[PDB]
């Protein structure tokens, strides 16, 4: 069957909720973005950054988890033969309490997350302020200055040599005081990548376009992957969203399968085509309908956990201007030819 296992109706509420939460659906936009990211991570070819722009509810974190799992699986059979190598290191950027981004905490937490192998792996990193402990976790004193932590992190990266270096929620890199300091931040990241030869992938919302093409040297070693949502002007995206809604309602662990394709306009209204937001909405609706033990979902149930109109109104405002910066037209190509003299 193309739907959920019908045995779940005998199971209690927790099992059905867990099954619905653990389900990952495959849709064309996620598939194409995942394929492009796999291709650009297989060989960087003189690139140090992968910029993955995606709106609030597009699947950035779950895509990162999926690619992390696939990279670990692909590295597994040679990992049995080759040691001193991690497949992938995944970290998330921290929004600082102060006005500027704190690089010392970033470096120490990068060392913490990267350095969790089995205790047999000993390297004796540089600087005397970094070591192991009795629990096997790296201890970092408060007296170590930021360049020392950077040198130790560089040594760890060049030793382990991960395939990619994931920095989730990369929007937090833009919290600085000086207007021009954005270039300096991105150049610091580039310098960290260069000595280690480690491809960095930055995941963030459409705000991350502030780091897009702020320098030509940085523009050369960056790859722009757009995790586009589903539009409404294009009938193809509308049909894709309808099909994904059909797949979701097909696999909902309920006694009566609800009909959802009728109010596709309603579902698009409160999700803007985002897939993670729709999945969370359906999860909350399922939890509500399963607390009352109702054999189905009712419209008013969708109205209960739907996001506020003000919330969805503004999300479109930042998405619409975000896509405008990412819009590539034939006019831009012609100006490139005219500037280059190739006309």
Ligand X SMILES: Nc1ncnc2c1ncn2[C@@H]1O[C@H](COP(=O)(O)OP(=O)(O)OP(=O)(O)O)[C@@H](O)[C@H]1O
Choosing from 115, 169, 237, 301, the residue that interacts with a second copy (CB under 8 A) is 169
Cβ atoms 62, 138 nearer than 8 A:
no
C-alpha span between 194 and 21 (Å, rounded): 39
Residue 174 binds to ligand X (criterion: CB under 6 A): no
Instruction: For Cα atoms 108, 111, 113, give the angle at the middle one, nearest 5 degrees.
Output: 110
Instruction: Pick one of Mg ion, a second copy, ligand X, none as the site partner of residue 172 (Cβ within 5 to 8 A by kind).
Output: a second copy
- 118-to-79, 84, 99, 122, 136 alpha-carbon distances in Å: 13, 11, 38, 9, 8
- Binding to a second copy by residue 13, rule CB under 8 A? no
Q: Which residues sit in the known binding site?
A: 21, 24-25, 27, 56-62, 168-169, 217, 220-221, 279-280, 283
Binding string to ligand X for residues 13 to 42, with x set by CB under 6 A, is what? -----------xx----x------------
Tell me which stretch binds ligand X (CB under 6 A): 81-89, 274-282, 284-292, 295-303.
Answer: 274-282
**Smallest Cα–Cα separation from 321: which of 214, 193, 210, 186?**
210
Q: Which long-range contacts (CB under 8 A, 24 or more apart) does 31-35 make?
A: 33/63, 33/225, 33/226, 33/227, 34/63, 34/66, 34/67
Q: Residue 258: left (phi > 0), alpha (psi -120 to 50), or beta? A: beta
Whole-angstrom distance, CA of residue 203 vs CA of residue 92: 9
CB of 61 to Mg ion, least distance (A): 3
Nearer to ligand X, 104 or 190 (CB): 190
Taking CB under 6 A as the rule, which mask of x and - marks residues 202-221 in contact with ligand X?
---------------x--x-
CA distances 313 to 120, 124, 206, 307, 310, Å, are 54, 53, 16, 10, 5
Site for a second copy in 28-87 (CB under 8 A): 39, 42-43, 45-47, 55-57
Nearer to ligand X, 57 or 253 (CB): 57
Residue 229 engages Mg ion in binding (rule: CB under 5 A): no
Which entry of Mg ion, a second copy, ligand X, none binds 43, CB below 5 to 8 A by partner kind? a second copy
Between CA 250 and CA 1 the distance in angstroms is 10
Q: Which residue stretch of 23-31, 72-80, 240-248, 264-272 sits at the interface with a second copy (rule: CB under 8 A)?
A: 264-272
Nearer to a second copy, 6 or 131 (CB): 131
- Closest Cα to residue 157, out of 120, 103, 189, 111? 111
Nearer to ligand X, 21 or 73 (CB): 21
Name the site residues for ligand X (rule: CB under 6 A): 24-25, 30, 46, 54, 56-62, 169, 217, 220, 275-276, 279-280
Provide the binding-site residues for Mg ion, judged by CB under 5 A.
60-61
């Amino acid at each position: 069957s193309t739907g959920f296992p019908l045995e779940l109706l005998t199971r209690p509420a927790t099992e059905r909720l867990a099954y619905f939460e653990n389900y990952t659906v495959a849709h064309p936009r996620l598939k194409e973005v995942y394929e492009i990211l796999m291709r650009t991570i297989a060989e960087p070819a003189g690139a140090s950054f992968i910029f993955v722009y995606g709106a609030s509810g597009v699947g950035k974190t779950t895509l990162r988890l999926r690619v992390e799992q696939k990279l670990t699986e692909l590295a597994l059979p040679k990992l049995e033969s080759d040691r001193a190598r991690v497949p992938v290191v995944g970290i998330e950027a921290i929004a600082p309490e102060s006005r500027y981004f704190n690089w010392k905490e970033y470096y120490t937490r990068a060392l913490i997350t990267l350095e969790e192998p089995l205790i047999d792996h000993k390297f004796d990193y540089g600087v005397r302020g970094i070591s192991r402990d009795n629990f096997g976790k790296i201890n970092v004193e408060s007296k170590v200055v930021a360049p020392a932590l950077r040198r130790a992190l560089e040594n760890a990266l060049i030793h382990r040599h991960p395939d990619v270096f994931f920095v989730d929620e990369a929007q937090h890199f833009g919290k600085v005081a000086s207007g021009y300091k954005l270039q300096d931040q991105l150049d610091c990241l580039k310098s960290l990548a260069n000595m280690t030869g480690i491809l960095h992938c930055l995941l963030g919302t459409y705000e991350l376009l502030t780091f897009r093409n702020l320098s030509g040297q940085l523009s050369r070693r960056s790859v722009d992957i757009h995790f586009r949502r589903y539009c409404a002007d294009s009938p193809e995206d509308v049909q894709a969203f309808k099909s994904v809604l059909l797949t979701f309602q097909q696999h909902l662990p309920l006694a009566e399968t609800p009909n959802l394709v009728d109010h596709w306009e309603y579902f698009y209204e409160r999700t803007l085509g985002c897939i993670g937001t729709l999945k969370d909405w359906l999860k909350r609706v399922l939890s509500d309908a399963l607390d009352r033990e109702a054999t189905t979902i009712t419209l008013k149930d969708l109205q209960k956990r739907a996001l506020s109109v003000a919330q969805c109104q503004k999300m479109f405002k930042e998405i619409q201007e975000g896509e405008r910066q990412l819009s590539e037209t034939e006019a831009d190509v012609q100006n490139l030819r005219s500037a280059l003299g190739l006309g």
